[PDB]
Swiss-Prot record, chains A, C:
Belongs to the PyrI family. GO terms for biological process: 'de novo' pyrimidine nucleobase biosynthetic process; pyrimidine nucleotide biosynthetic process. It comes from Escherichia coli (strain K12). Gene3D superfamilies: Aspartate carbamoyltransferase regulatory subunit, C-terminal domain, Aspartate carbamoyltransferase regulatory subunit, N-terminal domain. It comes from the Bacteria. Its cofactor is Zn(2+). Zn(2+) binds at C99, C104, C128, C131. This is Aspartate carbamoyltransferase regulatory chain. The gene is pyrI.
Swiss-Prot record, chains B, D, E:
One of its GO terms (molecular function) is aspartate carbamoyltransferase activity. This is Aspartate carbamoyltransferase catalytic subunit. L-aspartate binds at K84, R167, R229. The gene is pyrB. Carbamoyl phosphate binds at R54, T55, R105, H134, Q137, L267, P268.
């Protein structure tokens, strides 16, 4: 609850700090409020972020379906939630992740990473544009 | 302008059934009637950053048969990249200003793909990128399979050996699974099992496959017995138990093979096929190898010549 | 406010996130609350951290001296501040940092990092307990 | 019979302005109108006793474009010279009885010169002799410079990096100083300073040059920023401090460049040019590289064909 | 129980002026009046992970001259840390259940401090840990200055060579700075400058120190000329230029030296001291070395024997 901005609710425990680091969120002059380990009737234990006078992209909001799937992004204007988006999985993710295949060409060369995203039984599959191998998103680390 | 004119050939997964068929057709047409000045005034790069005999020699040979010239290197040891530490991109940023198409094989998965991003309006033909893909092997594999079997659909194909690191079988399984009603048998040590990504693909396409642990289990069901070498030089330390072959095909093992069945092998073989198989009417790997000439001639004609060869 | 715990007030903007990473503070099931870029009990902009059921030894608080000397730490019990302490320069910093010297015995071996802290002109110097070299606090990265 | 017919191309210092101009002219003429059967029935040696990618591949490519054949070797490891310990002279005493011209690069300064003394009526083209000369690089350098700048005279050229061992800049400074009113800026570590012999030459020709210690000092004055790689493999022990680059060009550093200025680099680059320069309108090294084809085609046509190509 | 009984001897920086004097005083007593069996029934570890001649040999000789037994290794090559990659920790943890004291040299800085953390009530004597400290070299140095200038206060002391990687000059400066009004001359290549921490400490104690580019500026007013060796095996790539001795003392350089001044060197020396210095009255490096026996007997006696010697 604030004048205008974004509230990301229902982030899972231990993810909140991550997203802070990830999207260089803390790198503004804006007011940010962060609760870690809040009780949550909804899920179980939850994290929660509020950035004032700041909004999320669309993909940035979907590139969020990876870690915070059942998260809810509220667009807030004049103290009233005027929007309620949800992260849906993108087709792909570029620049941000790193291929777990140590022999992938991506490591050595002047190229941004890139993976294909398809929902699997228990997880999310990531297929690298280059070495064409597929990994669980759990396996894949970030950079 | 034929569908394949100026296309990179990086990965089977990027090719339609129509495309494969088109290579095979174009192929036999040229084996029927050579066209020896077709790629006259073309210079092609034969850029092998790792060892090859069949793949390279067949390619350069095909280039000549079509009347093109060849510049290249057979290892990276005596390039700027080996001695002076140059990126692949930079390397592909200059050569692509020299030649009309780049045939290249590289030790890392994804290298041919990367080259396209720096190669400009110059096509790249992937001659092998790490344990990933081997489009041109597959093209000949297909050709050989049509040659000896009559069709590319409704076959019982067994693949045996290192299925994890064998780029040969990755490309071939993807290719075959673009045709109707083929069925697979995979014979591999658990450590070199066919990767989950090929399997998931078979399943989505609703294609029958099963694992086995001996050749005999499936012998009598098989139309094509595709043997593979263990990729010693691509292994990880925790896999050195798997260096020696796990399945050795002998001539005695061919007692119950259907009459039509051919034994293939992309080669080279260590011991996964004993030399006493060479003489049987089932051995077809050298014949298979010789088919690399027509597959590759085809591919080159298609990619660098606008209009189909009649 | 919280019932029982510690409250780190008067952290200079852009340090809050640093302290949250460097000391692995969100690595807890305990309920935490964080405000980035706030107007101050004193100054103009200010960061702030509250962590439930958690306390800092006078040494833990001193550790702050290198990143937020003006910070104030309030010990909270029963919603009341029962304690109020301030960061003074410590003797040492154990565990947190890694010695910049690549040939230090501290890397391969199973021991914790450790430096002596001293003020050296307009800067703090760190001398590794092991290799005895000296570095400016600015160069010595965290784990 | 054109002035360059049957001439060894060993060293810029042995060539007139008229000569350079003549290569550049002959060049563009063939880029305009290819002449693909010009050197038909010619066999050329591509004799690389040390690693090359651009220099070699461009040369062999050019030979093909003009319709000649190529025999050669890409390192000395598998010759008689490497394994059997043979002199260069003996080596050049036999090959010269085989081919119609010898393109060669060697690790020692003076090697191409030495080859002419044993090569008979066969021309030698120096593709790089130790840290000495690089005539053909210079020819393309020139071409690239005319291409992008309009002239070869009255330019502000900066050369940066290893100026002591860089054969590239030795040949290029000698070439440019045969044209009117060019001015040089040399940016090098003191240990790899441009050698006294190039300087003494500039002075006798009354040519303005000066040392600097940063790129910025001169940035805004420069028409051509010619970056060079540190010749790691040519260094002496007392110079190993200089292995890493001393001047790294970034895109941010191009704020104040005159609009016309191009960044050149004979390549390969280590880090003296960060990859973020590639995208700017000042980067012209890959384009530069591609120009090796026309410079070398030209040179070959000129040396092995009596009468000028129209 | 004297102040050094059972104490770790790791860094000069953790020792008092009285500590040092205690050792020297003891040294004399033992030199004048030996005590062949003062350390009977003791077994000591001589653990040298990096190479050593003087430091290991002198030390083991001390142990025998006092009646103790030695076990160890001169090379971490044949240990279970050398062929089986044991942690230096585990290594100390087991050795310290075998012996009454450990003398160790190690390539990593801080190795000795770390061992104290794993040896329990078994003392550890640093025999050199990478580029950090060399305590027992400082003690024989101190004994040697003492015996040749008759004091440790108010000396003009010059240090030449590699001061950055010189564990020898790190300990000796910290020890001399513990006495009064000693003045220092640091002569060395910029890249191998005496470390900031040593300078800050001198400053803090208000001790006069100054830099110099040659030995002749200071030669007239020095009492101890202390030459060192460029520590090539500890150099960084960017420093490999400095390998060669930059200051070479030779007998002619000693012409206007003081009658009393001695040339010292921890040894070994490369070329930094020409052999013509060897016979001059100023040469004292070999005497220096021989003095190690006394300082090391002394040190060993105090650490291992409860009651002061007589
Ligand atoms: Zn990958
Ligand atoms: Zn350290």
């Amino acid at each position: 609850a604030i004048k205008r901005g974004t509230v990301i609710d229902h982030i899972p425990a231990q993810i909140g700090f991550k997203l802070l680091s990830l999207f260089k969120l803390t790198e503004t002059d804006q007011r940010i409020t962060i609760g870690l380990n809040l009780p949550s009737g909804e899920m179980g234990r939850k994290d929660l972020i509020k950035i004032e006078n700041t909004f999320l992209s669309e993909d940035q909001v979907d590139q969020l379906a990876l870690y915070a799937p059942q998260a809810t992004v509220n667009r807030i204007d004049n103290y009233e939630v005027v929007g309620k988006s949800r992260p849906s999985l993108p087709e792909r993710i570029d620049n941000v992740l790193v291929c777990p295949n140590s022999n992938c060409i991506s490591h050595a060369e002047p190229v941004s990473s890139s993976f294909a995203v398809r929902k699997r039984a228990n997880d999310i599959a990531l297929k690298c544009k280059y070495c064409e191998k597929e990994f669980s998103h759990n396996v894949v680390l970030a950079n | 302008a034929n569908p394949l004119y100026q296309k990179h050939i990086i990965s089977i997964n990027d090719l339609s059934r129509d495309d494969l068929n088109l290579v095979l057709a174009t192929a036999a047409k040229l084996k029927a009637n050579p066209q020896p000045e077709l790629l006259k005034h073309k210079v092609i790069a034969s850029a092998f950053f790792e060892a090859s005999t069949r793949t390279r020699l067949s390619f350069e040979t095909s280039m000549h048969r079509l009347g093109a010239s060849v510049v290249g290197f057979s290892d990276s040891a005596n390039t700027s990249l080996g001695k002076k530490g140059e990126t692949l991109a930079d390397t592909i940023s200059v050569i692509s200003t020299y030649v009309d198409a780049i045939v290249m094989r590289h030790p890392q998965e994804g290298a041919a793909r990367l080259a396209t991003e720096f190669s400009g309006n110059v096509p790249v033909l992937n001659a092998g990128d790490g344990s990933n893909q081997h489009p041109t092997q597959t093209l000949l594999d297909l050709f050989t399979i049509q040659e000896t079997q009559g069709r590319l659909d409704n076959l019982h194909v067994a693949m045996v050996g290192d299925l994890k690191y064998g780029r040969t079988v990755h490309s071939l399984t993807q290719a075959l699974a673009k045709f109707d009603g083929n069925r697979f048998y995979f014979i591999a040590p658990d450590a070199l099992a066919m990767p989950q990504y090929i399997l998931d693909m078979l399943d989505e396409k609703g294609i029958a496959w099963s694992l086995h642990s001996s050749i005999e289990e499936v012998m009598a069901e098989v139309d094509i017995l595709y043997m593979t070498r263990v990729q010693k030089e691509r292994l990880d330390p925790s896999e050195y138990c798997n260096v020696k072959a796990q399945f050795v095909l002998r001539a005695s093992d061919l007692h119950n093979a259907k009459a039509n069945m051919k034994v293939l092998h992309p080669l080279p073989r260590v011991d996964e096929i004993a030399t006493d198989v060479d003489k049987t009417p089932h051995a077809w790997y050298f014949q298979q190898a010789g088919n690399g000439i027509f597959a590759r001639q085809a591919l080159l004609a298609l990619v660098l010549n606008r209009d189909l060869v009649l």
